[PDB]
Symmetry: D3
Subunit: 304 residues, 6 copies
């Protein structure tokens, strides 16, 4: 079997980078929409007995892209592919990973079941919102981490990183922040927005010392940037000299770009698990880390 | 168990009509989008041990609506509903019901598998593009027909229906047209667009006599209305006095409205398996048949 | 893995032809009946890690043959075959492909499920009665077409084929007839037997012109030959000079042979998806098209 | 839910007896053959939300009957039956319960899988050839025993039963014979036909004393009656006064009737798990035990 | 259906309390070991059509108890129980919820799959180590919380609770501690043991102010009590006046009792999700919160 | 793919012997217990695309070992092993192979389902208590026999084996004893312990002649040795000169060692499907047959 790399419509630049790093051309696929907005998938070459990798991030038109991915997986399976791997750099519906409300769906589990029934044999993803999503499948799931790239960026771009403090923007990010602070041998702090019991002002509590130090906000994602922006205001109010934000998934939906442009961030650093070209054109603060080498190595090791 | 009727975002007017005919209020559901365009489903009441019917047509934002339906089905199943029935008046991806091309997906089968893995126990649908889609599930699938309503409309709205000829716009509609012509005891004709071997003019062959008679075009759906419009031009060129078009699914995507407005149709008749309010505002020729009684009776009989 | 071709009891001559075209000997199998008429299957060689193809048509003792096929598939799977492919030239129960009656089984779906649970990984078949039967499986299903062989026979055996008209014996055959007429660039006609509302005479309506032309009846199968015989009487009554019947599946059950012998057919042409040796001995009008090359190529391409 | 009893073509007299003992009429089913010998099943009434019991023994046209049963189960499941129970008095392919030969199928497991995929929720059977066949399903399997009826017959029909010896015709029947001898507080003996190493005379070894005593041969089934006839010759040669044979499944295939008529049996006693009307007309030695009360009680207790 | 409560060998006192609160007697079960240490389960009453709840905590002989639970679930399913619910107050293998090491099993997912294949229809558990374990099943999973009982204990047993600080013993407990601190409107602190890069002294970093205040350590479990004991030493070294430890799962395996007896805890508070009778006899500091009302209410609401 | 042999904690000496006979080193695995007695499995090498064989007998800590085996199978499957084979020399729970009691579990079927859901693709076992356990899986199951080794031992260690009688200790062993007696061309006898109707003395009935001959007791297993010890007393009381006991599975649980030491056995012969080192130290009568060559050949042939 040979590696066949197919791109969905979501992140074709990343698919191209992966294919170039693998020394391959992207597989011939036409991924369009029928007139009635149904997903049209036209695989343009044989995948018989091939090791098929389909790259599709959960971003942009989320349901469009997920349906595209499922249809492409099923087409490859029925086309007698030896193995079909879904390379999903940002797993869609990953934040819906539990039922902590009445009648709430576990949408991540539903997405996993849909991928399984489409015929996926392997999942490669980066920085799952919850690592337990690996357990939502009965197939191997590669949960790659961008933390080494994030440490590289910190050591190369922040001069006073040895005296910095890594800040969690919420309680759920504590493990990630403590891991990064341990690897950098630096202090850490945590910021918590307390629960909205009524309609008073949202107030943020900070535990840890950030006074007269560079604060690096590290989180798994920035969707609306409310978390990181509120944390940044709190950090400046607490005496931080400079504030950085490093995420692995830059979703930047809704008011995020205006929020960041009006915030105090020295830089907002994200990986390219989600396309950032449009976001960078409206926010100069955004910088991107390439994770295509991580995904390419994951695909190569999965194949080998 | 009690009937619980939940509406997706696709066709809420039809859901309301079904609920009124059942003497029920629609179940409390919030069906919105998160900021990153992920489907958000918030069932607002208990469905424990209930007989849940979710109404969601394959129309509008097709993948959005299908994901909404799957998430709602899964939420109801995990919320311990006694039975979850997907009422899908127009089955999405129904035209992708076979693999007659290399690497082509059977998207209808994938949709059926996704509905099954979401936890649907029963499917109620109207006029499947292929009745064999019933066999794509391992659960009961109700394939309701709007043909009786179509005969009622013909007998009540076309004065010379006893001398009319029912015309198939393509070869695949022959069974439907012959059935309708048998029930009306009228002649039938078939129109075929021959295969596009090169880039010459599309030419249509008509078998049957339509000269100086009213021609009724009957088909399962009109997506772009290319089929019915070309058939209408052929029928007028063949000497038909008046031309009607009766469909059960009025998709009317793309250039369909302009095509119909510039066509010679006496009336374009569709059911309300797909919302038609917007279409009727731009095309006076469109008239709608209510099939809410058929769906309500199907739901009631399924429950009983 | 190596190709292993095993024959059931149904069509062993076709299995032999396939094996010869593949340059192989048929695998050693004893397919008999126990005294109590239970199917006895004794595979006489190892199939460990082999690519096993089991040839069994749905014909003759239908349930006997299908049980034989299922038992052989399961034996090969438990015997650790690398892949088991069911080569079913005529798919049994294919006409029971939908539920259009109360309490009606979808027997084709049941047969597909039985083949899947027996352990089939691949299905190779010719001219499924409904192509959607491909969607009854979750494994790849090859639906081969004998249409090219049927065009070859027409061009080589009917002198006036360029002025002929291809006739559908019922409404359901319209797509097949239109495709053949397009490929031959000839006229087509359709014959419909209207529905039996009471016990009066069956009457047939013909749409299209067949007067003073050779009429070629093309259908997917001739079971009792009532359809083709009634169509032939109608065609002669309509002024056809000569009438041919071309089928891909010659079932010829019940009164078919006497019907054909008393009909006006110039020739009844079938493929050898079903054994025809016995039928040809009692009906000189029957001629056979060899499709063993199509099946052999399908098996070879599936393996490769 | 209400009890619905449906009969296959195999044993309709037993189905009638069960229905009468349950105070019910048999459900309306037409179980015939299409012209091409495909099984035709036409359930003539609603089974929606019903507790459906389908009675079909593995006997007569074995594959015909099993396909009939599977099609009826699937039709009932798709017809939204609350529960479908297969009442199979004699389980087909039960003797193919293991793989003790190269490439041998486990046909009993295949039959169990086919019943499961057809949609059976419950199996009721009598005296499985191997009780471990219960483990071939993931659904409850009732393995009823006719041993109490066999003890009743012995105590009522054999005057010297207290001095009799119960004889196993082979090594595999030892448990059944020891159980019966324990319940009767009588001696037991075992007869073994040693393995056929070459083409010499089959010789039988008897362990136990049967001299000048009535010998009762007890086995689970008599297919060709070679086992019981050879055992009877051995028992007479060993000095048994009278020889009885009691089976639960009287298959009596092939030469069994001539073998019994030429044997020395005082009586051959079988249950009516298989129809015996034809067998009794040609062999006066055959007597039948009614087990319809056992099956009716099993169905009633399953329902309750 | 009626509630049937069955106890495994793990926590029979809790099962008795649940049954008393439900006004029921425990179902008759003999749960012993065969001589070869295989689990022997003897359900002593009918569960046909019953709503069966099996109470078995993951504690004591973990694999013994889990096998007992699986065997009891399967026995109830094969005994035709209407519904089988596994009441597992402490989910076994819950800490093995992800693959963050090469070749590491996801044992929680394996346990979920084993429970599913045993036939469990519903899981009721308290304070899953990871809430995403709910997504390891395709059945409803009730993840009950003992947090309200923990707040009740704090408000009733700690006089200065309004000036206390709730302390996380590790980074992973941050969400639980922040939730509790929000509900009590008190400060929170976090303690992190930094990663063991080499064999030097384990050192703990504290973020937050605990000086001259009562510190309440809140965590999901205390297995060896290394986490809480090290956190307690750090808290006293940081100037905490008194230190409490509140857990929901008191495992207290290995050296935990000696560790607590030599620690500075004012009280170690656990729920009775695990039996604590033996632990309390050797450690006076341990106090227990009854959660039997939570489990009983969960069972009652699941049934209703 | 390469053979990877992994040992569980149950029988590591047998795993070592198998690996040496295969010319391999055992795969690196740490199989220990966490503090709370949960099974800890740490596979120390890659198994990607490997043919993994896990050796784990059902013996010792039965549930501990079975959980170890399941966790190792699942870890290998998630670690992308090409194929995972469970080499289970003594199948656990094999005696719970049917439901002959109310509410009784079929624990063998549950174990098979657990192995299947853990991801086993192949089972290799020796002398299943019931061969129908092969049918409890849908994967190939190798049921190897130690009978040839048992015949070798008899012919090499019993001087008067040609005049011996092979004795079944119960009715269920009759087939095994008759097979062995046929292969040795010797007489056979059967011993039955009649059913315990009340609390009187257990009495044993012997059928067959053992007077003044060597008696060889052959059974599938000796758990408590009650069966073989009672049979030995009966055989001596019946005039047997010497009594041997040959088993394939020496469980020797509970009072078995004291029973054998106080019995009259010339030798108790078992295979090493279960470790016997401890048993031989307390009972000089026990001798062991090596079956490692049988298991090694089975693994090699499965791989090839
Ligand atoms: N795309 C989305 N955008 C915004 N909110 C979402 C989205 N998907 C799910 N949610 C909602 O967000 C919430 C999950 O929030 P979040 O992941 O920040 O915290 P958590 O899971 O409660 O705790 P933590 O991650 O700190 O352990 C849920 O209520 C979920 O329904
Ligand atoms: N939403 C869609 N809009 C347009 N074309 C579609 C859509 N979905 C599928 N198709 C394509 O349309 C074709 C199916 O066309 P159609 O159903 O008219 O004819 P058919 O299935 O070949 O024959 P017939 O229905 O006459 O038996 C396929 O090539 C399929 O990929
Ligand atoms: N072997 C068989 N012989 C005869 N009739 C059969 C057989 N199997 C199924 N049938 C019945 O024949 C009918 C199917 O007929 P047929 O395939 O000619 O038409 P259709 O499916 O209604 O329409 P069309 O094929 O024209 O789209 C069903 O009522 C089915 O039960
Ligand atoms: N319907 C049948 N008629 C005759 N033989 C059959 C039938 N079905 C299976 N067999 C064969 O009969 C054999 C099974 O024989 P039988 O059940 O008498 O003995 P066994 O299973 O080896 O041992 P025992 O039942 O004494 O424990 C197998 O070789 C099987 O293939
Ligand atoms: N019963 C057990 N006892 C001890 N350690 C266990 C047990 N089960 C699993 N482990 C191991 O403990 C580790 C999990 O530790 P823990 O749950 O404290 O932290 P985490 O999952 O890495 O992060 P966190 O819970 O803070 O988000 C894994 O290495 C796992 O293999
Ligand atoms: N590990 C075990 N130790 C002891 N008894 C067990 C064990 N596992 C199951 N049993 C019980 O032993 C009985 C099975 O006994 P046994 O296998 O000797 O006879 P059988 O299956 O009734 O008949 P036979 O094997 O002679 O055909 C059942 O009641 C079963 O529950
Ligand atoms: O609130 P947003 O900034 O839109 O979302 C980003 C954060 O919110 C969620 O907890 C994520 O895990 C991130 O920590
Ligand atoms: O009616 P018969 O000639 O027996 O059967 C042959 C035809 O009937 C069915 O529609 C088939 O598809 C063929 O078109
Ligand atoms: Mg979250
Ligand atoms: Mg967060
Ligand atoms: Mg179509
Ligand atoms: Mg059409
Ligand atoms: Mg037809
Ligand atoms: Mg047998
Ligand atoms: Mg026998
Ligand atoms: Mg923790
Ligand atoms: Mg047994
Ligand atoms: Mg025994």
């Amino acid at each position: 079997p040979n590696i066949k790399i197919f791109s969905g419509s979501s992140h074709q630049d990343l698919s191209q980078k992966i294919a170039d790093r693998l020394g391959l051309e992207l597989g011939k696929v036409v991924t369009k929409k029928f007139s009635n907005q149904e997903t049209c998938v036209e695989i343009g070459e044989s995948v018989r007995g091939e090791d098929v990798y389909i790259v599709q991030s959960g971003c942009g038109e989320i349901n469009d892209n997920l349906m595209e991915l499922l249809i492409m997986i099923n087409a490859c399976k029925i086309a007698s592919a030896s193995r079909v791997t879904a390379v999903i750099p940002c797993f869609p519906y990953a934040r819906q990973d539990k039922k902590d409300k009445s009648r709430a769906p576990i949408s991540a589990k539903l997405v996993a079941n849909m991928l399984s029934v489409a015929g996926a044999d392997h999942i490669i993803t980066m920085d799952l919102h919850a690592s337990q999503i690996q357990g939502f499948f009965d197939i191997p799931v590669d949960n790659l981490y961008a933390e080494p790239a994030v440490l590289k960026w910190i050591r190369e771009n922040i001069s006073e990183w040895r005296n910095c403090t890594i800040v969690s923007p919420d309680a759920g990010g504590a493990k990630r922040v403590t891991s990064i602070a341990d690897r950098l041998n630096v202090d850490f702090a945590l910021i918590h927005k307390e629960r909205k019991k009524a309609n008073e002002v949202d107030r943020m509590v900070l535990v840890g010392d950030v006074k007269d130090r560079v604060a690096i906000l590290v989180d798994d994602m920035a969707d609306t940037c409310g978390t990181i922006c509120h944390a940044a205001d709190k950090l400046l109010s607490a005496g931080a000299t400079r504030v950085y934000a490093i995420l692995t998934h830059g979703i930047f939906s809704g008011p995020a770009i205006s929020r960041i442009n009006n915030a105090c961030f020295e830089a907002v650093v994200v990986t390219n698990t989600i396309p950032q070209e449009d976001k960078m054109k409206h926010c100069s603060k955004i910088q991107v880390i390439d994770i295509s080498m991580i995904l390419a190595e994951a695909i190569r090791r999965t194949h080998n």
